Amino acid sequence: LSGRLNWQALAGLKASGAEQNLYNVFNAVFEGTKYVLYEKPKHLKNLYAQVVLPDDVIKEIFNPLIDLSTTQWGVSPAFAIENTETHKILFGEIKRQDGWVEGKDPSAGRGNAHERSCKLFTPGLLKAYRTIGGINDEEILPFWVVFEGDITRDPKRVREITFWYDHYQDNYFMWRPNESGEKLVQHFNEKLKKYLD
Amino acid sequence: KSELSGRLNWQALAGLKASGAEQNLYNVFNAVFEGTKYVLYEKPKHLKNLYAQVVLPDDVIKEIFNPLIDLSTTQWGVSPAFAIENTETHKILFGEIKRQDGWVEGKDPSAGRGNAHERSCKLFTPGLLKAYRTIGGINDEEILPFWVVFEGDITRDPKRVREITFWYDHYQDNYFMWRPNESGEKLVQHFNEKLKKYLD
DNA sequence: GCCAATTGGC
DNA sequence: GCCAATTGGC
């Protein structure tokens, strides 16, 4: 099964003048390929209820009338890309945020909600992602964060995120204003697709 | 490393408790550190200069906003909620305080839907981990260089407590749940028993 | 200049 | 059930 992408279908989406977002872009480029996109995938929805808490903690917290054995508490990624042959999955997030850009003061980029995406660096979620998605190669992280909005052109935010990721520079992508869906797909195609093999 | 050489001032903390004064992380640690080699910093400045000189490829520079300032002397960084330094060894533990509501008695489950506490996870990025270990001096692999103290109803929320427990995996001592009504002693005991030795 | 942490959205 | 990501605050 070739891993070639459907650039013709993507060009049609672009030509249809339709506003491109991550979903219609990957949906178009994956048509007839061995890849499929999921919006709000459910693979990681059953992680927390089964967590074993010391009896000392149980006594100190609120214990609702609930059957934890059948309770599914977990996370809901913005999206996931699956190679339907190997069934390996890359889970992703989309962080949209304003930023300090031309004509604005630094305060326009003072927001910090994007830090929330760093929950993916916790050892527990890294372990869960690797187990469920199948990407065990230590060379890359098992998630992909796509940033959107003026934060992607903010001199401070861009350097901050670059600093955070350190040697995992391909695990995030800055999808800048007015940029084509093609560049978003090229990042996946050139830097991440091989890890689903 | 004798126990006496690092004994905390438990009597000063008991005095604070006996005074009836409202306890918070700062007055609790300031009291317990009285006369010792440890000092607590509120908003430490050790990590004030981190990002401005980060190198960006020419093809990225071309696509971003480049302000007309001198990045070589610009200080962009972070400001931890607190830090604990052993002034004899100069090793430092950096900390955060995350207060948040939660699903507890008398509340609808929606009271625990909040997720801003996730921001604290920035400390797990490889970049900040390296910066924290370099500055604070803690390279022991079995412990992380930071300590996140949670406060508020989130500390008793059945889903949030399990979520955070899960996140931390085998680094359970790198966070502490300071519950409503809990005194300062429990907070200090966590540091004393699980983290203080990493400042030796 | 940097962090708080919430209420509304899907 | 779980995520969006902002504006207020010092």
Swiss-Prot record, chain A:
SUPFAM superfamilies: Restriction endonuclease-like. It catalyses: Endonucleolytic cleavage of DNA to give specific double-stranded fragments with terminal 5'-phosphates. Disulfide bonds: none annotated. One of its GO terms (biological process) is DNA restriction-modification system. GO terms for molecular function: DNA binding; type II site-specific deoxyribonuclease activity. InterPro entries: Restrct_endonuc-II-like, Restrct_endonuc_II_EcoRI/MunI, Restrct_endonuc_II_MunI. The keyword Nuclease applies. It holds the Pfam family RestrictionMunI. This is Type II restriction enzyme MunI. Keywords: Endonuclease, Hydrolase, Nuclease, Restriction system. Transmembrane segments: none annotated. It is an enzyme of class 3 (hydrolase). It comes from Mycoplasma sp. Its EC number is 3.1.21.4. It comes from the Bacteria. Homodimer.
